[PDB]
Amino acid sequence: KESAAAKFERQHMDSGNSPSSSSNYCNLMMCCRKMTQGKCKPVNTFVHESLADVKAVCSQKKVTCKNGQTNCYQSKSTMRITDCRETGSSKYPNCAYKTTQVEKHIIVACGGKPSVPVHFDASV
Amino acid sequence: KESAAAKFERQHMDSGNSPSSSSNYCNLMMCCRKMTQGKCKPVNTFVHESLADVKAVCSQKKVTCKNGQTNCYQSKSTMRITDCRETGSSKYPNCAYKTTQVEKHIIVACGGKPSVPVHFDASV
Ligand SMILES: O=c1ccn([C@@H]2O[C@H](COP(=O)(O)OP(=O)(O)O)[C@@H](O)[C@H]2O)c(=O)[nH]1
Numbered sequence: 660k661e662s663a664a665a666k667f668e669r670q671h672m673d674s675g676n677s678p679s680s681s682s683n684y685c686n687l688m689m690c691c692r693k694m695t696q697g698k699c700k701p702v703n704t705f706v707h708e709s710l711a712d713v714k715a716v717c718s719q720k721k722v723t724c725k726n727g728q729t730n731c732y733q734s735k736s737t738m739r740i741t742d743c744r745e746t747g748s749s750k751y752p753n754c755a756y757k758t759t760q761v762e763k764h765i766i767v768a769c770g771g772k773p774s775v776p777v778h779f780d781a782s783v
Numbered sequence: 784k785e786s787a788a789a790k791f792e793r794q795h796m797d798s799g800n801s802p803s804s805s806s807n808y809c810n811l812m813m814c815c816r817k818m819t820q821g822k823c824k825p826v827n828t829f830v831h832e833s834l835a836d837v838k839a840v841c842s843q844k845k846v847t848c849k850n851g852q853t854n855c856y857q858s859k860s861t862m863r864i865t866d867c868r869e870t871g872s873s874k875y876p877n878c879a880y881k882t883t884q885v886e887k888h889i890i891v892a893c894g895g896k897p898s899v900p901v902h903f904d905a906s907v
């Protein structure tokens with residue numbers, strides 16, 4: 660069971676950062692979205708366009724998936740995204756990331772009926 | 784089991800204009816620090832000072848806790864803190880927070896051995 664001291668540190672301590680630390684976006688988001696459990700997911704992209712716009716990519720340009728699957732689609736326009744990449748100094752369970760703001764076309768794999776994004780393949 | 788569509792939304796979607804803005808600090812932190820699981824914690828403060836400085840409060844000015852417990856202590860000096868307060872628009876599981884930065888004395892409950900902060904009581 661989590662100690663009261665550890666609980667206080669979790670709920671109330673942020674010694675290493677401040678709200679103005681914009682570079683801290685990936686650290687917090689990778690944590691929030693449960694991609695730092697068991698191991699640090701080394702690379703992950705968040706998309707800041709609407710869900711509707713990202714869903715619409717499944718009806719846009721058909722392209723080769725990096726893994727050779729044939730259900731990938733490239734966005735018709737660039738999108739505002741953030742790449743989160745684990746730093747060389749990063750070490751589990753303290754997963755540290757570099758935050759890179761980018762505007763590139765995205766490639767997603769689509770699946771299901773209706774066909775919706777299921778995997779982020781790449782930016783180009 | 785988490786659907787593929789939902790997994791993509793969790794891993795790859797953060798729709799919005801200024802994702803890394805200081806205004807989003809509480810949204811990110813309250814999620815990462817596990818205070819939005821089950822329900823939105825309505826009010827929470829993060830402290831930007833060193834753990835040593837916060838621990839030092841346990842040997843400073845004794846004050847009664849808001850709840851009548853007798854193990855609270857007030858910091859002799861002000862500390863850099865961030866208050867996170869639920870917005871009007873906020874409703875679980877879409878917890879939404881207003882981020883406000885202030886410099887105030889903190890009041891914490893101290894417990895255990897060594898006596899360390901275990902609860903954040905108030906700022907003054
Ligand atoms: O630009 C990228 C590249 C990869 N990924 C994620 O990283 C995972 C796999 O990483 P990558 O393809 O780079 O390495 P590999 O699959 O060869 O191990 C994928 O599931 C994606 O979710 C991402 O979010 N953005």
Ligand SMILES: O=c1ccn([C@@H]2O[C@H](COP(=O)(O)OP(=O)(O)O)[C@@H](O)[C@H]2O)c(=O)[nH]1
Nearest residue numbers: 670671826827828829849902903904905906
């Ligand atoms: O300035 C504050 C006041 C409250 N809290 C947190 O909010 C919880 C309860 O809030 P409070 O006692 O102030 O009001 P209550 O919810 O009991 O009516 C506490 O456990 C604290 O962790 C906080 O972080 N900062």
